[PDB]
Design a protein around this ligand. Structure first.
Ligand code: FDA
Ligand code: NAP
Ligand code: MG
Length: 309
């Protein structure tokens, strides 16, 4: 059955925490664990980082933590590094179900010369490698939490939530789905439909697949899960299989759900949004509908939730 979580007082706040810690005085959190999420054929390393905040930096699902990596700002001598934001991949209780930890899902940014393929560690991403190189006991300067765009609308516990992720964009949805399905949260009993679409390069690049597959077996009437493996599958037009192509496969169901009030969420690569928009326009056209008019209504009705970069 559902996993006991504590403390229940994390359900009491009526508003999300915001900017509890600020860059000039971050919270010094401690790494609990860092593990790779991916297999040897993944094009890059993505890691799962568990951070002990001690209950000092609570958050709601869908929010981000800021991390200030060590060092000086290259563009401002004497200044600390800029905050990098990471979407929290855990529920407010965290992976130890105790309200003391939060988790990040971090892609290592690695630079390769476009011509030679030669790696250049000096051009790698500072914070992502800092995080995935961390070890238990290391300290992390945390700020935030921040963000409200991806907060989960809970007013209707039987709402439909269609979640579209590319890569580490799956982060908030891991938290949504644990709250919907895994954790014993007496004041939020989800009875709607949650539908996760996840795009990753190949099978070795899947993130949390065992967890999501378990929900299909535990909640077959409330959870659907579709994957687009870009380098293992091709779309109807001959391009790599992206999430927009999986959305197209279920266009009639998705449009009906949206017309019925479903929320739809997009997280991950900013580059996926033009492709999604093009696909949805084409689907609407085939149905004799205007996508522009539909999207305007979804935005007016607060059904459309995008956080990409
Ligand atoms: C709201 C929100 C939420 C999230 C994210 C963003 C935002 C806006 N991100 C992205 C994350 O904040 C961050 O931008 C990336 O982890 C990269 O940060 P680094 O400090 O690693 O790279 P850094 O900022 O140091 O560098 C940026 C890029 O420039 C490249 N670069 C550096 N020097 C170069 C040079 N001389 N020539 C060419 N290239 C060079 C680096 O390789 C890197 O790709 C994210 N990410 C994630 O993995 N998981 C998440 O959950 C989130 N969540
Ligand atoms: N809130 C936020 O803003 C937020 C939260 C989390 C993550 N992010 C960002 O989202 C990105 C996730 O990327 P990642 O490095 O984890 O994954 P990635 O491996 O670079 O890409 C994930 C999948 O998306 C595919 N893809 C590439 N271009 C696409 C397009 N135009 N449309 C649809 N799919 C496309 C990729 O296929 P190919 O590589 O085969 O083309 C891959 O299969 C990260 O850069 C991260 O910084 C942002
Ligand atoms: Mg795997």
């Amino acid at each position: 059955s559902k996993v006991s979580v504590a403390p229940l007082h994390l359900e009491s706040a009526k508003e999300p925490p915001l900017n509890t810690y600020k860059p000039k005085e971050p919270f010094t959190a401690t790494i609990v664990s860092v593990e790779s999420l991916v297999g040897p054929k993944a094009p890059g390393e993505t890691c799962h980082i568990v951070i002990d905040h001690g209950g000092n930096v609570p958050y709601w699902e869908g929010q981000s933590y800021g991390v200030i990596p060590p060092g000086e700002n290259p563009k401002k001598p004497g200044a600390p590094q800029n905050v990098r934001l990471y979407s929290i991949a855990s529920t407010r209780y965290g992976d130890n179900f105790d309200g003391r930890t939060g988790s990040l899902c971090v892609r290592r940014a690695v630079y390769y010369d476009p011509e030679t393929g030669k790696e250049d560690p000096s051009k790698n991403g500072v914070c992502s490698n800092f995080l995935c190189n961390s070890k238990p006991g290391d300290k992390i300067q945390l700020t935030g939490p921040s963000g409200k765009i991806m907060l989960l609308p809970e007013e209707d516990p039987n709402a439909t939530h269609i979640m579209i992720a590319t890569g580490t964009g799956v982060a908030p949805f891991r938290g949504y789905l644990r709250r919907m399905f895994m954790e014993d949260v007496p004041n939020y009993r989800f009875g709607g439909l949650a539908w996760l679409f996840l795009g990753v390069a190949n099978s070795d690049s899947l993130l949390y697949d065992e967890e999501f597959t378990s929900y299909l077996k535990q909640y077959p009437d409330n959870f659907r899960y579709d994957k687009a493996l870009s380098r293992e599958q091709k779309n109807r037009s001959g391009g790599k299989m992206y999430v927009q192509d999986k959305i197209e496969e279920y266009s009639d169901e998705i449009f009906k759900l949206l017309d019925g009030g479903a929320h739809i969420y997009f997280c991950g690569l900013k580059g996926m949004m033009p492709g999604i928009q093009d696909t949805l326009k084409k689907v609407a056209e085939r149905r004799g509908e205007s996508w522009d008019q539909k999207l305007a209504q979804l935005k007016k009705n607060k059904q459309w939730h995008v956080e990409v970069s």
